[PDB]
Coordinates of C-alpha atoms and ligand atoms in Angstrom, one line a residue:
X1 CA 5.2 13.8 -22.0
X2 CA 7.1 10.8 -23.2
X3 CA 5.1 8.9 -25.4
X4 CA 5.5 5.5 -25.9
X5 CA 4.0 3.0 -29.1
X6 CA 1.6 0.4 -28.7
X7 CA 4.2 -1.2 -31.5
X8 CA 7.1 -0.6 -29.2
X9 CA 5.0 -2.7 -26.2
X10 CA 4.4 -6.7 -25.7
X11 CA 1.8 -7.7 -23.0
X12 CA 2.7 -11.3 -21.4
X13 CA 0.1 -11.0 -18.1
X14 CA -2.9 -9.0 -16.7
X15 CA -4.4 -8.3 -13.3
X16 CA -7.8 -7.2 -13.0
X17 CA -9.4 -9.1 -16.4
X18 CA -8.6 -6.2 -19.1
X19 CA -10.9 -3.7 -17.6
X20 CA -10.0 0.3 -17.6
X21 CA -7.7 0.4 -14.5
X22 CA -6.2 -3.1 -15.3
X23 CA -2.4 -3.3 -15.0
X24 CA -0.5 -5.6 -17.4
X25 CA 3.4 -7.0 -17.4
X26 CA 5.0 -6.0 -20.8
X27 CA 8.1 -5.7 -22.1
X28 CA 9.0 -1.5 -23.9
X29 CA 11.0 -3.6 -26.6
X30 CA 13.2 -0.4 -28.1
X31 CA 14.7 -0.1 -24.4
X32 CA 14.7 -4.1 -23.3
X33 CA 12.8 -2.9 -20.1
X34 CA 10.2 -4.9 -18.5
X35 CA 7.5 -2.4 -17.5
X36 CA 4.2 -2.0 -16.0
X37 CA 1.1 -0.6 -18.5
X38 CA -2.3 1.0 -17.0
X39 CA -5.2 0.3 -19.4
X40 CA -6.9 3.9 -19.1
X41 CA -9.9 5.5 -20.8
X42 CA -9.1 8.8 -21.1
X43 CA -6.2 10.6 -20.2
X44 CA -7.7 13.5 -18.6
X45 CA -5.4 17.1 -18.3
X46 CA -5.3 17.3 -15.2
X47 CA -3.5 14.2 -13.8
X48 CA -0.8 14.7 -16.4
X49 CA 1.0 16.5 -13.3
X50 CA 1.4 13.7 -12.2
X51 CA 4.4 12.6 -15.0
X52 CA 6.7 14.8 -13.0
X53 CA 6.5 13.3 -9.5
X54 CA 9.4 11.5 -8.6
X55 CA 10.7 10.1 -5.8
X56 CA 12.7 6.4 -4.9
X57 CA 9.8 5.1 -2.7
X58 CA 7.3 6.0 -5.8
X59 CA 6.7 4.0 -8.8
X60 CA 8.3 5.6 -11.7
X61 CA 6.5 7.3 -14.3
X62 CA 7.7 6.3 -17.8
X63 CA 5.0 7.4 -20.6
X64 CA 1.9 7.4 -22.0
X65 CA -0.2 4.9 -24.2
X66 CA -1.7 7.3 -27.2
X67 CA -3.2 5.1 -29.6
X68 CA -6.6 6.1 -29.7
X69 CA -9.0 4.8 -28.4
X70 CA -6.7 2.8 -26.9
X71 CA -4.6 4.7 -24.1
X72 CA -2.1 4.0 -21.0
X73 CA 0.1 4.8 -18.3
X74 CA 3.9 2.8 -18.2
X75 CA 5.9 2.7 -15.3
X76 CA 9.0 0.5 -14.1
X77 CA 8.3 -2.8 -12.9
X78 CA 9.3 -3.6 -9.6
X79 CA 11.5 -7.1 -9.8
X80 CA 10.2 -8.7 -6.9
X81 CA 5.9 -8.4 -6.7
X82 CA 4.1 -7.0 -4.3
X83 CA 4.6 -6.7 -0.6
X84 CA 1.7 -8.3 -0.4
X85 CA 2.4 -11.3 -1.7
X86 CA 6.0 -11.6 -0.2
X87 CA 4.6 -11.0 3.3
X88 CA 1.8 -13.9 2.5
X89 CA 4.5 -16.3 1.6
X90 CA 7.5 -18.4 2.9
X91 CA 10.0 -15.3 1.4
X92 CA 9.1 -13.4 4.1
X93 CA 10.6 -15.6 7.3
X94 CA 13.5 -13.2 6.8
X95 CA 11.6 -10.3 7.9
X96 CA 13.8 -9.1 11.8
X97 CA 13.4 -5.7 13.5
X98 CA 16.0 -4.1 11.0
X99 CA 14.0 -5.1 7.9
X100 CA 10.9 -3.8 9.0
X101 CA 11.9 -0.2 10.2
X102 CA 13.6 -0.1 6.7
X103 CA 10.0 -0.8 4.8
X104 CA 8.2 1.1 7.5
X105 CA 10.4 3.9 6.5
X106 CA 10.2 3.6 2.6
X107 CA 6.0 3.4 3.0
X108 CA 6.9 6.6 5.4
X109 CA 9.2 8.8 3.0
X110 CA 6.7 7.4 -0.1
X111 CA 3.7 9.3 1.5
X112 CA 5.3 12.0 2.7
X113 CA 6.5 12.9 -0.8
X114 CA 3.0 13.0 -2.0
X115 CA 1.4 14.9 0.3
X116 CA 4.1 17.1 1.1
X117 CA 7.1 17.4 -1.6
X118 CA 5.4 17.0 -4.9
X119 CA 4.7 20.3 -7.3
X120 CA 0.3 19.1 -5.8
X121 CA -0.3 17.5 -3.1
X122 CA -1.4 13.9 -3.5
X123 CA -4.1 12.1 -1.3
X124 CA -3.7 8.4 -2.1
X125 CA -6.7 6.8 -0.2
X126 CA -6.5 3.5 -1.8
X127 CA -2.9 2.8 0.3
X128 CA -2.8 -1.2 0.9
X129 CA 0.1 -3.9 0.8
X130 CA -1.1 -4.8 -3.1
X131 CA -0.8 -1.4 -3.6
X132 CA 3.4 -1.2 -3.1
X133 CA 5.7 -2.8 -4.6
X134 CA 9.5 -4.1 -4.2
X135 CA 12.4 -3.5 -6.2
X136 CA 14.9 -5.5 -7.0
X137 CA 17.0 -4.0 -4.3
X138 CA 14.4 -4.0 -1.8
X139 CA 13.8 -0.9 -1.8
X140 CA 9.5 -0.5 -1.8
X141 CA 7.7 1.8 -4.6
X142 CA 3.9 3.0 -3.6
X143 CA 1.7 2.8 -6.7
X144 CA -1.6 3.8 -8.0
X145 CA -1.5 7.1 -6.5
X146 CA -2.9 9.3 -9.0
X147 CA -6.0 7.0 -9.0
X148 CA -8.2 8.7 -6.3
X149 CA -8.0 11.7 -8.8
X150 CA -7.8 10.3 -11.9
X151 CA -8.4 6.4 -12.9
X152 CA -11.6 6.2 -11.2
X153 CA -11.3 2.4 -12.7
X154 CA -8.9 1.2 -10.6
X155 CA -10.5 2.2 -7.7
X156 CA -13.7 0.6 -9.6
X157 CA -15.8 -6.0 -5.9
X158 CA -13.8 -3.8 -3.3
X159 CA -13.5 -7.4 -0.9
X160 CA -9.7 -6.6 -1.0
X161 CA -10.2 -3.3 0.5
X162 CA -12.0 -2.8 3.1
X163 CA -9.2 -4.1 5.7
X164 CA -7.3 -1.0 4.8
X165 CA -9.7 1.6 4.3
X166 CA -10.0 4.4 7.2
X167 CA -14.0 4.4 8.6
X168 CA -13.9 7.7 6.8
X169 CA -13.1 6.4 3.9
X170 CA -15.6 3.5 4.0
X171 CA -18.7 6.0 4.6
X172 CA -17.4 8.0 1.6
X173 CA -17.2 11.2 3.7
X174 CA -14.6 13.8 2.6
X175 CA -11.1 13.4 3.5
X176 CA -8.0 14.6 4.8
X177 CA -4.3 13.8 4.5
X178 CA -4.5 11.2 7.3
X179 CA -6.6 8.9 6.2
X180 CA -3.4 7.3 4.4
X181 CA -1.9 7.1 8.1
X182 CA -4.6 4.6 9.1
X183 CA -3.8 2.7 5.9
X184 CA -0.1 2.8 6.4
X185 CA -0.7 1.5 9.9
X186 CA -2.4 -1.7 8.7
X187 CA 0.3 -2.2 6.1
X188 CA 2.8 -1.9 9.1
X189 CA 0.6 -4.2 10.9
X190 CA 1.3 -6.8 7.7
X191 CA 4.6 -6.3 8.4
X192 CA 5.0 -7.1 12.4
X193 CA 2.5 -10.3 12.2
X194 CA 2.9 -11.6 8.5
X195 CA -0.9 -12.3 8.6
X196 CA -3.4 -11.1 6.2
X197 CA -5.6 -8.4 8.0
X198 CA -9.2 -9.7 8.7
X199 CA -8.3 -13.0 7.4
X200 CA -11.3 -14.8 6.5
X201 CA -13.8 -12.6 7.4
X202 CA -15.9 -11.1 3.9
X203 CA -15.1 -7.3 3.4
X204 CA -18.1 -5.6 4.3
X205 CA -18.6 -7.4 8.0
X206 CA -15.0 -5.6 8.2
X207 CA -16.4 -2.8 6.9
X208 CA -18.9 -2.4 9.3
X209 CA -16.8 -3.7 12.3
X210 CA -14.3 -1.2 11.7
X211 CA -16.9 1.8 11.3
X212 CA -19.6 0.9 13.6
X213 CA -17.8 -1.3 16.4
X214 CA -15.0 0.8 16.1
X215 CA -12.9 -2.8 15.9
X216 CA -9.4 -3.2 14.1
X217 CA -6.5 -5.6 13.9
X218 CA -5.6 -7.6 17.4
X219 CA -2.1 -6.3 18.4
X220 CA -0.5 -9.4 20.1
X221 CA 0.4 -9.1 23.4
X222 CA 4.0 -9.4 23.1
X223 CA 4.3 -7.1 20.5
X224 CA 6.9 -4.2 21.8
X225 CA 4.9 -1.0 22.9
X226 CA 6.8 0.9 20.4
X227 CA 5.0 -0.3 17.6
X228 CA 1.5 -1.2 19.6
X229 CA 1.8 2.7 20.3
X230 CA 2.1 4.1 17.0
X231 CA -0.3 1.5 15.1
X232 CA -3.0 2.7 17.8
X233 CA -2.0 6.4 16.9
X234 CA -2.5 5.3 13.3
X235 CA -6.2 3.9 13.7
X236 CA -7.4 6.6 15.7
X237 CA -11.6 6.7 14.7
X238 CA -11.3 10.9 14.8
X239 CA -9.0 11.8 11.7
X240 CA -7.3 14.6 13.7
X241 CA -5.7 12.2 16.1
X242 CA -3.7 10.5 13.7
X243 CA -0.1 11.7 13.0
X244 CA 0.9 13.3 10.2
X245 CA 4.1 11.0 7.9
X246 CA 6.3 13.8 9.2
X247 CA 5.3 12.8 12.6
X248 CA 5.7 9.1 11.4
X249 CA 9.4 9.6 10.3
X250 CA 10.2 11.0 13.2
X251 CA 8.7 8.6 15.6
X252 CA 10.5 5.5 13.2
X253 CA 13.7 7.6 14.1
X254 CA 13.0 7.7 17.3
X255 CA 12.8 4.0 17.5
X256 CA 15.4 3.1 15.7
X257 CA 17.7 5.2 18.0
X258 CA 16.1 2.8 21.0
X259 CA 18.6 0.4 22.0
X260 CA 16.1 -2.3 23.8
X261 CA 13.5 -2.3 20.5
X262 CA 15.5 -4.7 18.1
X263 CA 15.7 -6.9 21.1
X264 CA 12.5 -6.8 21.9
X265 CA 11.1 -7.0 18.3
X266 CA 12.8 -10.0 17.0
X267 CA 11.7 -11.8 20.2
X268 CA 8.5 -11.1 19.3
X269 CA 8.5 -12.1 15.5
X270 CA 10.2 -15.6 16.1
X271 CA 7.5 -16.2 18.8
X272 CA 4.6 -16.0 16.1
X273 CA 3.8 -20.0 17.2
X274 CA 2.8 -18.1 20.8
X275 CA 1.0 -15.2 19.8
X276 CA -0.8 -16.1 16.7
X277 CA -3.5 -18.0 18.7
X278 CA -4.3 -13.8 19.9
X279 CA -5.2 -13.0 16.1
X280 CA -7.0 -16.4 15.7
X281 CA -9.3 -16.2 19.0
X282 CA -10.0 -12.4 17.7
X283 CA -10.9 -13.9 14.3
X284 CA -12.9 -16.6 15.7
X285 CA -15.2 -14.2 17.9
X286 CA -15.8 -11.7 15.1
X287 CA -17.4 -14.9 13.2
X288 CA -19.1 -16.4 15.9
X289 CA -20.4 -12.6 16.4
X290 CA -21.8 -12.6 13.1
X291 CA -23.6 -15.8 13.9
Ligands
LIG301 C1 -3.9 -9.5 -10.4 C2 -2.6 -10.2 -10.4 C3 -1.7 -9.4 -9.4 O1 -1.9 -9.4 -8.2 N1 -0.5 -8.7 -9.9 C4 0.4 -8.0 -9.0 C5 1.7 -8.8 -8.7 C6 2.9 -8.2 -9.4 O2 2.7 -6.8 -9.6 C7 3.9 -6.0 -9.7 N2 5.1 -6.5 -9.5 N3 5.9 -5.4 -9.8 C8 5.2 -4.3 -10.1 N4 5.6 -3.1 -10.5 C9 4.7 -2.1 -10.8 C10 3.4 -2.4 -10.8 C11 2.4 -1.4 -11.1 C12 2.5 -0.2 -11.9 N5 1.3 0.4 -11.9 C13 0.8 1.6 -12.6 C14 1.0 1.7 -13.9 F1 1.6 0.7 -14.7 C15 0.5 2.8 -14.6 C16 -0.1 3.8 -13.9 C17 -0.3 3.7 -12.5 N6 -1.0 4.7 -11.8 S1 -0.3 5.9 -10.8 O3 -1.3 6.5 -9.9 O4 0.6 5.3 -9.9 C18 0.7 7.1 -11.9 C19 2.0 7.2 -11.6 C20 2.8 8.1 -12.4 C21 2.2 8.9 -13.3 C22 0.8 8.8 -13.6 C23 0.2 9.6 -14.7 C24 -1.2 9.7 -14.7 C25 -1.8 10.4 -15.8 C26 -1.0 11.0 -16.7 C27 0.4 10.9 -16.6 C28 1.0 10.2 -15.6 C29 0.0 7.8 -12.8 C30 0.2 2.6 -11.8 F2 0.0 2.4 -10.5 N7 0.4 -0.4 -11.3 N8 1.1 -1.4 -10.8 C31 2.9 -3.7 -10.4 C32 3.9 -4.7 -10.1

């Protein structure tokens, strides 16, 4: 249990207001490293399993915050923000077939670690775009984690949510392993259409269209079968149905060991101008619904 000095820490930014669960940007001054610090309020026993889990597709545990009553978690800061924000942006026009089976995959591995590899098996449940992070290499780190069991803070508005959440997870039912597929398939869906998920529509009429209606994200069309296939395997409404990310890895190999997919796929992303009036039509009736 590394400990690390409110003296040895300077704060420059904040997300989430300074609440319990809010993250800040700060430089750990004795090793020159920009890092990420969790305000918590307690560090309870149990989570502190969680120091040891580490893994390249996981956001890296660097110490604790005792300064009572002050305390915090520190981990590295991935270089370039959230893959929610690069996919929402002009940075991600770069994003071909090639790219996106390499995130897919680092998402995959990420989750498969924690439920699998770990020393305790982790059930994230709050999985989302804002929710991983990129390196400066690229290579994506999941975060927040631990929070399902411990900082009850950062899970708690939940606006921001909802469009990620599995229905089981919106009606607060218990929960297995899988419910993380169903959130890793909207975060692939990010991916293949660069479009926020439910854009425009206020979380709980998504909340209620994907539990009751049993609605989710438009697929477009042309979007190859490969990954229409496994994003409706992801979103199954029965929990069972959904593949495990062993399964997952596997079918990514699979796919990446099909010669007609990166063909297909980067026909299909460079024909957003075609397609995107699918997700907007979708969008429109799910509004005009409401009225
Ligand atoms: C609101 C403005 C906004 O949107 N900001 C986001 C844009 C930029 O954000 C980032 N860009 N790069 C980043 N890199 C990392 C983060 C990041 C790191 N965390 C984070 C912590 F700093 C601390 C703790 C946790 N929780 S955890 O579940 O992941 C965890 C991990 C390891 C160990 C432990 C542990 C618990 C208890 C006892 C011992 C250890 C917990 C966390 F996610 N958050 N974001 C952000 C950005």
């Amino acid at each position: 249990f590394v400990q690390i000095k409110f003296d040895d820490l300077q704060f420059f930014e904040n997300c989430g207001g300074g609440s319990f669960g809010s993250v800040y940007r700060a430089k750990w001054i004795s090793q020159d490293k920009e890092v990420a610090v969790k305000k918590l309020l307690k560090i309870e026993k149990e989570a502190e399993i969680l120091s040891v889990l580490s893994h390249r597709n996981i956001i890296q545990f660097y110490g604790v915050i005792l300064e009572p009553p002050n305390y915090g978690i520190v981990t590295e800061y991935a270089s370039l923000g959230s893959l929610y924000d690069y996919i929402n942006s002009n940075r991600s026009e770069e994003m071909d077939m090639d790219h996106i089976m390499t995130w897919a995959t680092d998402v995959a591995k990420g989750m498969h670690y924690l439920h699998m590899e770990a020393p305790v098996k982790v059930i994230h449940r709050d999985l989302k775009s804002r929710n991983v992070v990129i390196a400066a290499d690229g290579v994506l780190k999941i975060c927040d984690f631990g929070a399902s069991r411990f900082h009850n803070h950062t899970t708690h508005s939940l606006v921001g949510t909802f469009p990620w959440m599995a229905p089981e997870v919106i009606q607060s039912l218990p929960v297995s392993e899988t419910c993380d597929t169903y959130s890793y398939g909207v975060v692939l869906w990010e991916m293949l259409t660069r479009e926020v998920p439910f854009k425009g529509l206020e979380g709980l009429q998504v909340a209620w269209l994907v539990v009751e209606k049993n609605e989710r994200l438009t697929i477009p069309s042309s979007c190859p079968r490969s990954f229409a296939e496994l994003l409706h395997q992801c979103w199954e409404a029965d929990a069972k149905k959904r593949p495990s990310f062993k399964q997952i890895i596997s079918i990514l190999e699979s796919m990446s060991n099909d010669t007609s997919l990166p063909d297909k796929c980067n026909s299909f992303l460079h024909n957003k101008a075609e397609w995107r009036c699918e997700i907007e039509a979708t969008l429109e009736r799910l509004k005009k619904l409401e009225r």
